[PDB]
Amino acid sequence: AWPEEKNYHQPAILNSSALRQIAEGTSISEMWQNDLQPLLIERYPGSPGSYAARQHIMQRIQRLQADWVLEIDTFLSQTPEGERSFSNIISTLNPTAKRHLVLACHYDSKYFSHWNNRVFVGATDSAVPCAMMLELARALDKKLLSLKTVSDSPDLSLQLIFFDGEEAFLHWSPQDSLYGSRHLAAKMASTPHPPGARGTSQLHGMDLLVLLDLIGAPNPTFPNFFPNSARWFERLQAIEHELHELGLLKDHSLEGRYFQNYSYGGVIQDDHIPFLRRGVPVLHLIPSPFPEVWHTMDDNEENLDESTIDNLNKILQVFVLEYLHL
Ligand SMILES: COc1ccc(NC(=S)NCCCn2ccnc2)cc1OC
Ligand SMILES: [Cl-]
Ligand SMILES: [Zn+2]
Numbered sequence: 001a002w003p004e005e006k007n008y009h010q011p012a013i014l015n016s017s018a019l020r021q022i023a024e025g026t027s028i029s030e031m032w033q034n035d036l037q038p039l040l041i042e043r044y045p046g047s048p049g050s051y052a053a054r055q056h057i058m059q060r061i062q063r064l065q066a067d068w069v070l071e072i073d074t075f076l077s078q079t080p081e082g083e084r085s086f087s088n089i090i091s092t093l094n095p096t097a098k099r100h101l102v103l104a105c106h107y108d109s110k111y112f113s114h115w116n117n118r119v120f121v122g123a124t125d126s127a128v129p130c131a132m133m134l135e136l137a138r139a140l141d142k143k144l145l146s147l148k149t150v151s152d153s154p155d156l157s158l159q160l161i162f163f164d165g166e167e168a169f170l171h172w173s174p175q176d177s178l179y180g181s182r183h184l185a186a187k188m189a190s191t192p193h194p195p196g197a198r199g200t201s202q203l204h205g206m207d208l209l210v211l212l213d214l215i216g217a218p219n220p221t222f223p224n225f226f227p228n229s230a231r232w233f234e235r236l237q238a239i240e241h242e243l244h245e246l247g248l249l250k251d252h253s254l255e256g257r258y259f260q261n262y263s264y265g266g267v268i269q270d271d272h273i274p275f276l277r278r279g280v281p282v283l284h285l286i287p288s289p290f291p292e293v294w295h296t297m298d299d300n301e302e303n304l305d306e307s308t309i310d311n312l313n314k315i316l317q318v319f320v321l322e323y324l325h326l
Contacts, residue, residue, distance in 0.1 A: 002098050003204040005154060006281070011235055011322035016246060022318050023248040026139040028310035035060060035138075036131035040121045040301055044111040045084045045165050045179075053107050053130075054087060057162055060134050061091050066144040068137070069095050073187065077179050079169050086164040088180045091137075093147050094157035098194050099205055101323050102159045103136070103316075105129030105212045106166030106180070106271055110295065118297040123304055125294065126166075128216035132309065133160050136317055143326045156207065158324060163271045178271060185274035203280055208232060208323075210283045211272045215312060217291035218305035219256055223264040226276075229283045232319075233259065236283075239318045240311075248314065251307040258312065264288050 014022065038056045043049035054072070061068050073088040089107065092100070107130050109122035121127065137144070137160065147157050165179030188202035208229065224233040237259040243249050244257070272282040293299040 006207040012325040031135035035134040039127040043109045064141045067148045089162040091160040097157040099156040100159040103210045104161035107162040110167040124216040129212035181271035182274045213286040216304040220287040249311045
């Protein structure tokens, strides 16, 4: 019955003083300089930047005190440009814990031939989501380090996934997109979890996949996409509302709130799809509408909004602590 524990799992909700501490514990300027700026480079698969992006994400995780276990899931696949190597980065606390909350984004940038003297760096898409995950790891390090301590009083921890090869090379289709995610979901589906078990796979182990994409533009609006994760999306609305009311958000009004009551009339393709189709519950933190700059050379650092990202960092960090009971 352990694979059903996720259906009954409740948050341990932070009080006001805890919320203030979380809000004070994250640094948007430190993220900007140390986590975000190095990723703002061309990083399509096999490019020098793909290698540098990968190294940057690993080193940043390595310096932290929490007991993160890193693994590079490297594979080859045919593409419209010929065979390419892809590498998902998986960073895991407590890898033998039966359950994990999983946060994810893609670290590859879409390939574009250079227009004027300009290159596409996918600032919202998804360098900012990567940086937010790294800042989350750093900001919560002391709290996460406590998961190293084994206790009677759930068998639940945290995993981060930075997918390679989310983007189409040429034209989005089932076969030219989601190379990293289709590979990893397939592997996890085939892999026993916990080790030695019968029946259960690493996908049963995924409580919830929180997939960040297209984050960093001002005034984003996120639909509540899926009934099976609606209660968790509702927690994000309430965290946002509470942080607002306590004066812990910046340049944020109730009218301009991010997390919306409405859903979306269509299906958005992204890295969650190969997990969702195999039954994993997904919280897809991608906005509708997409950033105005989407898939334009304008998806760049100048067009990011610092306050928005700092606000969303606070809300995500609170969510994660509440989910993990920390
Ligand atoms: C410009 O607005 C949109 C364009 C297309 C879609 N539909 C789909 S299926 N998009 C999949 C995007 C995959 N991806 C994510 C990041 N980089 C690429 C929805 C849009 O606004 C709701
Ligand atoms: Cl739209
Ligand atoms: Zn994209």
